[PDB]
Design a protein around this ligand. Structure first.
Ligand SMILES: O=c1cc(O)n([C@@H]2O[C@H](COP(=O)(O)O)[C@@H](O)[C@H]2O)c(=O)[nH]1
Ligand SMILES: O=c1cc(O)n([C@@H]2O[C@H](COP(=O)(O)O)[C@@H](O)[C@H]2O)c(=O)[nH]1
Lengths: 209, 209
């Protein structure tokens, strides 16, 4: 129930830390901090080297036509799933779902975000974004560890069968145990990758739950 | 007043079309369709080969800490400016502005989007996103060619001194002339890059205005 957010920017460090904590995870979330620094080939390298599933956290948030192109390039690169913003609307999300269907991959819909600024505009639209996901057939979602009451409401909307992962654990203030009352898995970045001993940090999280 | 949205996915085609229309533009918008296919080095290559300013259209839409990393990698790659979503809130936008200040670069704030789905959630928050930009000191904005009445309202909020660029011209239905009544420059992608003669398409747009 632990997903590593590998946001280190250099390949050697990213490979070192991921290898050190492999026994505690099975899924690695790779985003733009690593991809824009080392290239899209890093996805296939990780997939092969560690045998872990890769979620490409690209927060896709463009018009339908561009979203289609982004998803196609991402799945061609070997990603198992891609995270997509729901705020740009149903057509933009559907474009991602269509490419995922064509390529036998998955889409994760980001509903409410975990940082303070999410309260400004995203929070007020989050319940509706989650309902839109349900209506579009989305089965994978992302919700905030920093607001468990919101994570609870989001879980209520998507149902128990939907898969929900949650970032904001550790560095941002979220708690592993409380978050897992509602989410199926927690995403952890800095608490593990900036630790003096990443494996010890990961093991500690796995034990606390 | 014409910016090329270079969304072709292969380097050879992208280089061919951009070179053919160079005399009609001075700024190229490069997004993820090209970057995720050919790598971040394509930005410096274009900048050197064509001597054009490059706007990295990455629709940055993450938490502050990740946005900082994305902006740093993007400016290190040579981009002159980066497009950032305002929907995730002020802290996320400020993180981008701080990196731009540190690196002597610019941030463009995306307010309302041009596609149909933008009406679902973005449109209702767009005026407030634009006001947030003004309050944060943002001087560069993106608004929709497909809704000139909204582009007018956005221009009203940001003032005449702010720089406003606008996509949705051509393929999405927007008109060059009407859009330029409010925007300083128009962004055009498919109408030019999918044309049998891109230079002829660009020249035709430049003439119609
Ligand atoms: O609402 C959200 C959605 C995210 O994807 N994330 C992401 O999850 C990760 C959390 O990292 P960290 O554990 O270091 O705070 C980062 O990669 C971040 O971009 C987030 O923090 N909040
Ligand atoms: O609201 C917006 C913001 C954008 O950046 N864009 C972008 O501007 C370009 C418009 O391309 P086109 O002229 O082919 O429709 C694309 O790169 C797209 O991602 C848009 O279409 N609408």
């Amino acid at each position: 129930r632990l997903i590593l957010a590998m946001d280190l920017m250099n390949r050697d460090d990213a490979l070192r830390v991921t290898g050190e904590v492999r026994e505690y995870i099975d899924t690695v979330k790779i985003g733009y901090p690593l991809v824009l620094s080392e290239g899209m080939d890093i996805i296939a390298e990780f997939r092969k080297r560690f045998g872990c599933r890769i979620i490409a956290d690209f927060k896709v948030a463009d018009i339908p036509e561009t979203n289609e192109k982004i998803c196609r390039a991402t799945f061609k690169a070997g990603a198992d799933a891609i995270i997509v913003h729901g705020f740009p609307g149903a057509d933009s999300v559907r474009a991602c779902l269509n490419v995922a269907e064509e390529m036998g991959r998955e889409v994760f819909l980001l509903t409410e975000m975990s940082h303070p600024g999410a309260e400004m505009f995203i929070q007020g639209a989050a319940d509706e974004i989650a309902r839109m996901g349900v209506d579009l057939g989305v089965k994978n979602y992302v919700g905030p560890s920093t607001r468990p009451e919101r994570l609870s409401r989001l879980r209520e909307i998507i149902g128990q069968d939907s898969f929900l992962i949650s970032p904001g654990v550790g560095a941002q203030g979220g708690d592993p145990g409380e978050t897992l009352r509602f989410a199926d898995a927690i995403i952890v970045g800095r608490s593990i990758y900036l630790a003096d001993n990443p494996a010890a940090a990961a093991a500690g999280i796995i034990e606390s739950i």
